[PDB]
Swiss-Prot record, chains A, B:
It comes from Staphylococcus aureus. Pfam families: Beta-lactamase2, LPAM_1. The gene is blaZ. This is Beta-lactamase. Its EC number is 3.5.2.6. PROSITE patterns: BETA_LACTAMASE_A, PROKAR_LIPOPROTEIN.
Length: 256, 256
């Protein structure tokens, strides 16, 4: 197969970065191109919070309020003017891409400002968190706001989680969420051999920016394969096509 | 307060149209001004499909395939390759802003084409459906694609649900999906007294386009008040302020 042909075929753009955690083999097509990462950012945001907040403390509470409410928050919507623990807050973010849960998680971290420098400290001078959800989705191929290359964002998912500074309990919490998230069944999950497991977090933005990042797990393999697939179209209101992600997933997984 | 002073207080554009379906009294403000409708239109599409499917046949199933899946489908994301009843579809979209659902419903009608002939048949040549869910969220103060105006949208809801050809069951079914959803809690629901039952549907687009349409029930009245508030800011990335919606619903309501 060929990723290049996939672009002619689908008239989209492909940003790929696969890093085997075992071999250390890196497959990449356009991994140094900037694309809108979209809601996939919530892996980074909640991995960071897990760095500071111990698992024995995820029972803690935060009071959700009116100003904390944003469009598209399936669960947190039922908590307006109420409390909720961090665990439940982080599950909403990952299981449902709840926006109220992500923004609250960001504020607890100290704001976009903090998330940003942590990236820097992590040694990531590419990812550019500038806005909160839902605004981070208004992508413009002219701007850099809320963008990242596949190799940059790809390494960050690695350095934060795989070879992370997280605990073993937090790490396994996150991964469970990402494993049971039914939102990516028509993307990567739909393209990796039946046997492989995927801990994912997808997204979509303007310009038909459909993405999916996941920690894939081959047969008999213990170390996943970090797989960041970022894609996009030439036009603002173009409809994306998950098939392209599913197909890009299998062209690349052939190498692993 | 005054609608002209809240635009100052929040630096936004308020568009209002409240219709007292009993006396016929109207309260307007920038009623002829095009505002993006966003998901408020999910109330139109479901209403339309409920004019051609008697309640006793909402249990008719339709298959959901990978192909049907789109971003933000909290419910329908779990039906990849599963059948689902018409009733379930409506609930999904009406209660969760599920887009895979809103699009299934649009498909069941005969497409935006049918939806469109109907709006013309209702005497609505203002509402401008062009794109689908999600893309219809990408508002452009320049474009007129997927826009309506306070009065046009208000009246269309009136001719459709409020005293329109849906059946008793079908009208209670839809109004219940609107009364019981927890997403307009901070919007119109906030402003009017708890004596006022509120059945609504919200939406949010670019340029902080936070809208909210409802059929508000004054304490001691079975006749509803069609309240249509559409608002927005000048910049593509601004943050919305539901307070603006609440306050507006509070003042506009003083006049009824």
């Amino acid at each position: 197969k060929e990723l290049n042909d996939l672009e002619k075929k689908y008239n989209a753009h492909i940003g790929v970065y696969a890093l085997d955690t075992k071999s250390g083999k890196e497959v990449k097509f356009n991994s140094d191109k900037r694309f809108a990462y979209a809601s996939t950012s919530k892996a980074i945001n909640s991995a960071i919070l897990l760095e500071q907040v111990p698992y024995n403390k995820l029972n803690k509470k935060v009071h959700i309020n009116k100003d904390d409410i944003v469009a598209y928050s399936p669960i947190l919507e039922k908590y307006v003017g109420k409390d909720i623990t961090l665990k439940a807050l982080i599950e909403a973010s990952m299981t449902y891409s709840d926006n109220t849960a992500n923004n609250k998680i960001i504020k607890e971290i100290g704001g976009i400002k903090k998330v940003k420098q942590r990236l820097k400290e992590l040694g990531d001078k590419v990812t550019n968190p500038v806005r909160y959800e839902i605004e981070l989705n208004y992508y413009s191929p002219k701007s850099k706001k809320d963008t990242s290359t596949p190799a940059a964002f790809g390494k960050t998912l690695n350095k934060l989680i795989a070879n992370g500074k997280l605990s073993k309990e937090n790490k396994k919490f996150l991964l469970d969420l990402m494993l049971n998230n039914k939102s990516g069944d028509t993307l990567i999950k739909d393209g990796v051999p039946k046997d492989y497991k995927v801990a994912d977090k997808s997204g979509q933005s303007t310009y038909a920016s459909r993405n999916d990042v996941a920690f894939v797990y081959p047969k008999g393999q213990s170390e996943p394969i970090v797989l960041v697939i970022f894609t996009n179209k030439d036009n603002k209101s173009d409809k994306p096509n998950d098939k392209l992600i599913s197909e890009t997933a299998k062209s690349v997984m052939k190498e692993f």
